[PDB]
Amino acid sequence: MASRILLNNGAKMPILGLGTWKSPPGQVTEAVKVAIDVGYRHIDCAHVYQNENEVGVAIQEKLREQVVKREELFIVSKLWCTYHEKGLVKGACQKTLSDLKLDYLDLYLIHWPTGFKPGKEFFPLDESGNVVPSDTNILDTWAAMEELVDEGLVKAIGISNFNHLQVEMILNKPGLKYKPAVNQIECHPYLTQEKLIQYCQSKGIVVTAYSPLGSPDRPWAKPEDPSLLEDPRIKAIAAKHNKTTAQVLIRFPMQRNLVVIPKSVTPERIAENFKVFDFELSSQDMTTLLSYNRNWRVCALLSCTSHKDYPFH
Ligand SMILES: NC(=O)C1=CN([C@@H]2O[C@H](COP(=O)(O)OP(=O)(O)OC[C@H]3O[C@@H](n4cnc5c(N)ncnc54)[C@H](OP(=O)(O)O)[C@@H]3O)[C@@H](O)[C@H]2O)C=CC1
Numbered sequence: 116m117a118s119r120i121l122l123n124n125g126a127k128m129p130i131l132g133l134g135t136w137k138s139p140p141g142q143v144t145e146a147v148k149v150a151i152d153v154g155y156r157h158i159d160c161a162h163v164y165q166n167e168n169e170v171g172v173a174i175q176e177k178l179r180e181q182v183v184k185r186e187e188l189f190i191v192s193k194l195w196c197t198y199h200e201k202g203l204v205k206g207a208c209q210k211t212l213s214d215l216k217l218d219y220l221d222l223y224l225i226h227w228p229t230g231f232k233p234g235k236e237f238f239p240l241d242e243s244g245n246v247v248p249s250d251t252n253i254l255d256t257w258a259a260m261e262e263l264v265d266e267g268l269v270k271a272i273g274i275s276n277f278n279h280l281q282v283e284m285i286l287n288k289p290g291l292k293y294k295p296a297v298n299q300i301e302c303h304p305y306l307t308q309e310k311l312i313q314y315c316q317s318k319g320i321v322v323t324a325y326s327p328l329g330s331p332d333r334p335w336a337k338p339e340d341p342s343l344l345e346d347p348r349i350k351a352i353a354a355k356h357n358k359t360t361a362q363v364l365i366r367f368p369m370q371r372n373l374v375v376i377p378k379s380v381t382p383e384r385i386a387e388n389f390k391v392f393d394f395e396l397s398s399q400d401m402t403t404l405l406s407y408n409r410n411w412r413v414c415a416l417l418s419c420t421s422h423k424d425y426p427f428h
């Protein structure tokens with residue numbers, strides 16, 4: 116496999132990147148250093164993750180060491196929900212750039228379609244526990260993202276967690292200027308997203324699969340929950356190929372023409388997750404992994420579900 120995919124903005128995106136949600140701030144710097152030493156060239160970030168500063172320390176040291184050049188790196192971040200206001204989008208992007216020690220992002224996403232009342236709180240609630248919406252819609256927020264391309268802050272814009280009607284609403288926006296480059300959605304063998312992926316790929320949007328390992332460190336993990344890394348069906352495919360389960364979970368979206376962003380702070384795992392270019396899953400391996408779909412989401416949130424734009428009804 117070619118190591119990069121061509122986007123509808125003309126740039127090439129490494130198909131394998133490093134995730135950073137939940138990476139503790141005292142470990143994420145070494146994580147990203149090691150990642151780069153062993154060959155990673157794409158890092159996935161977000162402001163709501165609260166660790167962009169520490170990610171940035173690593174990026175910067177490897178650039179300084181001349182281990183890599185900036186052009187050889189592909190750095191992604193996302194606009195949080197309390198910043199769906201015309202007047203808040205740019206500042207939100209800039210805070211992220213500052214923290215990352217960068218002067219552009221390769222890609223910037225609307226993290227979720229729902230806007231919330233702005234303020235300090237990432238999730239503002241009424242006295243009864245409902246998120247307090249913003250009256251601002253996804254079309255007006257998109258217009259605000261387009262502006263960031265046009266300002267040089269970001270090389271590409273995209274969406275995250277948009278449903279088909281919401282992607283359509285974006286694509287049908289009166290006066291649309293830049294199509295989304297990417298829709299980053301949860302995707303793994305238990306939420307395989309074929310409908311939304313085909314809709315998006317048919318429209319030339321590249322899909323990035325998040326939580327490709329099923330996010331075992333998610334904070335609301337319940338013991339009863341399904342586990343990809345421990346799914347023996349998947350372990351078997353791995354053994355056949357003389358690879359790890361994680362290596363298969365990573366190679367899977369790669370062969371669907373997806374980008375994939377597994378998270379780790381463990382040095383040996385970071386090296387392991389990169390050794391995914393010297394083997395191929397067969398077609399049969401691929402269909403088999405697809406068959407595991409159960410419409411199971413890592414990422415959903417009850418306090419947000421009455422919001423007019425909550426994506427998952
Ligand atoms: N757009 C959105 O709304 C969302 C975006 N994302 C993005 O996607 C990234 C990946 O998703 P995320 O939810 O973090 O979860 P992942 O599916 O990437 O799983 C991460 C977990 O897997 C472990 N792990 C990593 N490599 C291995 C390996 N080789 N063997 C065993 N365990 C391993 C990590 O442990 P350890 O770190 O201890 O090594 C960590 O606990 C996020 O970090 C974030 O960047 C995720 C959710 C939502």
Ligand SMILES: O=C(O)COc1cc(F)ccc1C(=S)NCc1ccc(Br)cc1F
Nearest residue numbers: 136161163164165196227229414415416419
């Ligand atoms: O969101 C991430 O990238 C990873 O997850 C998170 C990462 C954070 F740093 C803080 C909260 C979340 C949550 S609780 N995310 C789920 C979620 C948020 C908002 C809406 Br609308 C629906 C929803 F399902």
Ligand SMILES: [Cl-]
Nearest residue numbers: 161162163195
């Ligand atoms: Cl964010």
